[PDB]
Every structure is written in structure tokens, then in C-alpha cells.
Write a protein that binds this ligand. Sequence first.
Ligand code: HEC
Length: 123
Amino acid sequence: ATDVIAQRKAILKQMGEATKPIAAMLKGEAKWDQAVVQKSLAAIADDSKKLPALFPADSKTGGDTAALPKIFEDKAKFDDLFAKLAAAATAAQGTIKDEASLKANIGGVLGNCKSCHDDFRAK
Ligand code: HEC
């Protein structure tokens, strides 16, 4: 075993950064860029496929993590929420093709972030 807590925080930090250009477009502070959006959705999908392998029970007493112990009492649900986000971002690469579809469809993707945080991340 190795520092999976450091690994997973690095990947989730990247996920956070991938949402930044999308938020900027939604705010009207950055112009629509289909390539940038595709890049962010692809990162979100790839990160979500990697994260399921980085939350071992032997790291529940890790010390520098915001992961809640609840994760290990509902692991199937936790794992599947990442699969849900991976599938949402993957579907969004096909459904988000212009600014209008970004505004109509991005919520389905981003809502998964809060859904998991409310149950499994420290506040
Ligand atoms: C559970 C299925 C999750 C999903 C879906 C998403 N996140 Fe999350 N995230 C989760 C946990 C358990 C944690 C704590 C990790 C730890 O070990 O401390 C996080 C953390 C983050 C972070 C902070 C990373 C850091 O630098 O320490 C960010 C920026 C973050 N998460 C972003 C984020 C986004 C943008 C998501 C949706 C696209 C998202 N997370 C989903 C659990 C889960």
C-alpha cells in the first residue's frame, strides 16, 4: 500500500479544476469553447473511473483526509456514485455541443458532486 489519500486528493483537485472553465462559461465570464468543455468532461469521466480504487478501509484512520467513515458502511453506494458521475460526464460529451446545450445539460453532471459530498465528505 501507498499514500492513496494523497493520490485521490490530487485527482479530486484536478476534477475541481476541470469544472472551473465550465463555471466561467456559465457565468458569462469566458466565451463558449467546445474543445475546453469536452476536455473537462473527459477529465471528470476518467477521474471518476480511477477514484473507486483509492478508498481502502485501512486508510479510514489516515489523518489528512476529508473522507468520512460513512463511506465504509455504504461502500457500494459510494462506488456507484462515482460510476454515475462517470456515466453522466460521458453522456454529456455527446449531449453538450453548444452553449445552449451546456446550459440545459450541465446540471445533471455537476449535481453528482454535491450528492456525494453531502454524505461522504467533511463539511
Ligand atoms: C463521491 C462519489 C464523490 C464524487 C461523486 C465527487 N467527490 Fe469530490 N470528494 C469526495 C471525497 C470523499 C472527498 C475528500 C477526499 C479526501 O480524501 O480528502 C472529495 C474531495 C474533493 C475535492 C478536494 C480535493 C483536495 O484537494 O483535497 C475537490 C476539489 C472535489 N472533491 C471536487 C469534486 C467535483 C468538482 C466533483 C464533481 C464533478 C466531485 N468532487 C465529485 C467524494 C466525491
